[PDB]
Ligand SMILES: Nc1ncnc2c1ncn2[C@@H]1O[C@H](COP(=O)(O)O)[C@@H](O)[C@H]1O
Ligand SMILES: Nc1ncnc2c1ncn2[C@@H]1O[C@H](COP(=O)(O)O)[C@@H](O)[C@H]1O
Ligand SMILES: CCCCCCCCCCCCC/C=C\[C@H](O)[C@H](N)CO
């Protein structure tokens with residue numbers, strides 16, 4: 040029981056997030072209302088105070104004499120699902136015959152979509168994102184040819200044994216999900232749920248994954264978010280003997296059922312490395328085009 | 337006939353001269369009323385802005 | 387009546403006679419974690435007044451050539467007062483913050499600082515200049531503590547993103563002819579209900595001159611920028627011995 | 632709340648943060664000509680927004696020795712924009728005007744301009760000095776166009792009348808320590824319902840320094856006076872080819 | 877239908893309209909989102925809101 | 935169904951009868967149009983209409 044007044048009257052524990060704003064339906068662009076001349080003292084829409092941190096509240100109607108316009112222009116194409124639910128390339132896997140990289144007929148790809156700039160720049164507009172996804176696998180030879188070859192794709196979550204050869208016992212796939220498909224078949228396609236241990240994936244994590252001294256050698260771990268590490272994607276030609284053909288698997292991802300939070304400035308310098316915002320210090324370029332003088336076009 | 341809103345709501349054509357002042361009868365000079373001391377903040381009749 | 391203000395919390399009070407309203411980040415006030423969002427089962431500790439109060443941590447000098455600085459939260463406070471102690475003894479922490487940046491001059495000085503809060507402010511390096519070396523920033527640059535850290539390349543926020551768009555984040559400006567402070571309230575931002583005050587900085591505070599400081603010879607040339615902040619709705623859990631990192 | 636103002640008409644907006652209210656000449660707002668006052672039978676044209684808008688026509692420099700200037704209405708606008716075209720193509724014209732004279736300085740400058748509107752401002756000449764020669768002012772002095780004209784003898788308004796009594800006309804003062812502009816609204820004044828925009832100037836605008844401009848060496852010495860005006864309730868009739876005079 | 881509530885958007889303040897043929901909802905199409913917006917959250921997050929007509933700093 | 939009104943003909947004075955399997959209406963079949971015609975618009979656009987029996991110019 041509580042008896043001293045400061046305890047009774049305290050707000051310690053209020054779990055309700057007091058919100059100053061709320062969403063309104065806006066299926067179309069706003070309309071324009073008729074306006075006329077205003078010759079007044081006291082009323083001054085045009086004057087603002089940007090220091091406050093808010094954007095100007097002045098509208099067309101108050102700055103010029105406007106007509107009435109019934110705007111039926113839709114806002115549907117700018118929803119998160121509209122912007123993001125379009126398949127883009129997020130991974131390429133090579134399976135050569137005579138090669139330096141994967142001459143053994145299998146390959147392991149750590150799932151990380153930050154290797155391609157188009158897709159990456161788009162998702163990095165937000166800090167946190169939660170979504171489901173549709174993955175499509177397009178396979179062919181390096182010339183774009185289709186050959187009668189059978190492949191196995193397996194999803195290996197963190198902790199499951201990664202295959203170490205085309206004949207690894209792990210390909211028994213008694214629990215992991217695998218897809219068996221021919222290059223001659225249409226691209227394989229599957230749905231993936233939101234799998235992070237967190238409520239969202241986060242393209243930016245200002246911190247370290249572990250405790251301890253963060254000495255120079257363990258600085259490559261700054262920014263590493265295990266909550267974003269979903270595992271490995273493994274592929275192999277299905278046989279006990281080497282395949283007769285060199286292959287390429289291109290991975291496309293289409294997000295769906297998207298939610299995003301905390302928008303941020305968009306990347307303006309070329310990307311250099313996966314999941315790390317390093318930029319070339321000697322080649323810092325302006326965000327856009329430049330001109331010779333401010334008084335000339 | 338008029339149908340677009342800006343035309344309906346416009347004041348183009350108002351022939352009435354809006355007047356801010358009006359005449360009052362004044363057959364004699366104004367009278368003087370009794371007044372007393374005023375020791376106040378906020379009230380300042382003497383100060384003007386020509 | 388919008389230019390004047392008083393912020394009182396704990397045993398501390400701040401006054402200003404040249405304010406520019408108050409920004410409440412993302413439109414919401416700090417709040418404690420709900421029983422449905424929570425996951426850890428131990429009863430949390432909510433010290434209240436001993437930790438939710440204003441702490442004045444640092445003063446920088448604004449010079450005609452300053453590039454700008456940043457601080458990381460809650461890093462700036464992990465070693466200060468009762469808040470720090472709690473952050474060290476507990477694995478889990480969560481809180482909001484009221485940030486009040488101060489800077490006054492004269493009606494004859496000029497300049498404008500952009501004061502903004504950027505969640506998950508991951509720092510990048512110049513990659514050996516040529517961009518061929520995959521270097522990483524050292525602990526002292528990622529978690530600079532109370533002293534903060536000076537930006538090497540403000541135009542790209544030392545992270546390859548344009549400062550020209552930083553206004554998409556909660557912010558205010560300190561434009562000397564107008565105001566002498568910025569006040570921003572920030573709720574707890576993260577993809578988890580609680581986290582480590584040591585391993586993870588939820589956001590960074592940036593103070594960057596966009597219109598350079600200027601004045602005529604003879605006017606006071608020392609123009610300080612002081613940082614004062616107060617945790618709000620602090621909660622801690624997962625108690626054990628104190629740890630500094 | 633009387634010091635601040637916004638004037639919006641047409642596609643133009645004016646702002647001021649150091650105003651001194653607004654004068655409405657002779658206490659009445661501009662209005663269109665009534666069917667009982669009118670005499671011409673053709674349906675008039677009332678272009679509206681394309682001509683009733685603010686036009687910024689001229690800038691003069693206020694010097695410690697300036698005598699003052701004047702402009703004639705509607706002469707100042709007969710060659711500008713869609714208004715000018717209408718004034719040239721039509722025999723008949725009528726309109727009111729919103730005049731906004733601008734002049735800012737610093738809290739360290741001083742001086743006061745008298746801004747007034749004088750209907751039927753007929754200019755006189757000095758009559759050969761001795762007063763024996765019946766001379767007349769040249770067209771360029773009676774209808775100076777946008778450039779205006781400088782007063783030769785401000786004390787008598789170049790017309791043998793005392794400027795000391797000019798305040799009997801609609802006016803405002805621009806006293807630097809107080810305001811940076813003057814705003815005067817003028818209705819159509821004439822003994823006829825409509826008239827020629829070319830042959831007759833309904834009134835003159837006078838801007839005359841009464842308390843001389845002054846400041847210490849080192850303060851900005853270029854103090855401009857800019858003239859902006861907007862026709863109101865413009866009406867035209869008696870259409871034919873364009874004529875400039 | 878009678879499926880699992882697997883979707884990444886289950887519990888969203890905006891309702892979607894989708895198609896599906898499997899027992900797991902995350903397999904469903906993207907569908908149509910609801911058209912609500914809250915610009916103020918980012919563009920006007922001030923404590924004491926000011927009018928369009930007023931002088932922002934008084 | 936519950937789709938978007940994307941069709942190039944949305945708001946047409948003649949109604950169509952089509953088939954579709956997608957959320958966007960423009961993906962639908964051409965269907966059947968309505969059989970209305972207005973020859974007069976092109977063949978007889980005169981202000982003062984004249985009869986068949988009369989002498990056109992009187
Ligand atoms: N930010 C916005 N974007 C697009 N349309 C809007 C917006 N805000 C309001 N509207 C539309 O304008 C109407 C509300 O006008 P009001 O009551 O003055 O806010 C609604 O029916 C909306 O469709
Ligand atoms: N300008 C004026 N000159 C002379 N007498 C006036 C004037 N204004 C008002 N009055 C007189 O004062 C009375 C009105 O006083 P009040 O109601 O305070 O305006 C009337 O009965 C008038 O006779
Ligand atoms: C049968 C094969 C199925 C293939 C399975 C694909 C699972 C992919 C899950 C989507 C994960 C989203 C991306 C997450 C994190 C980023 O790529 C980086 N780690 C950011 O550091």
Ligand SMILES: [K+]
Nearest residue numbers: 067068070110
């Ligand atoms: K609308």
Ligand code: NA
Nearest residue numbers: 083084086928
């Ligand atoms: Na305003």
Ligand code: NA
Nearest residue numbers: 380381382383
């Ligand atoms: Na008074």
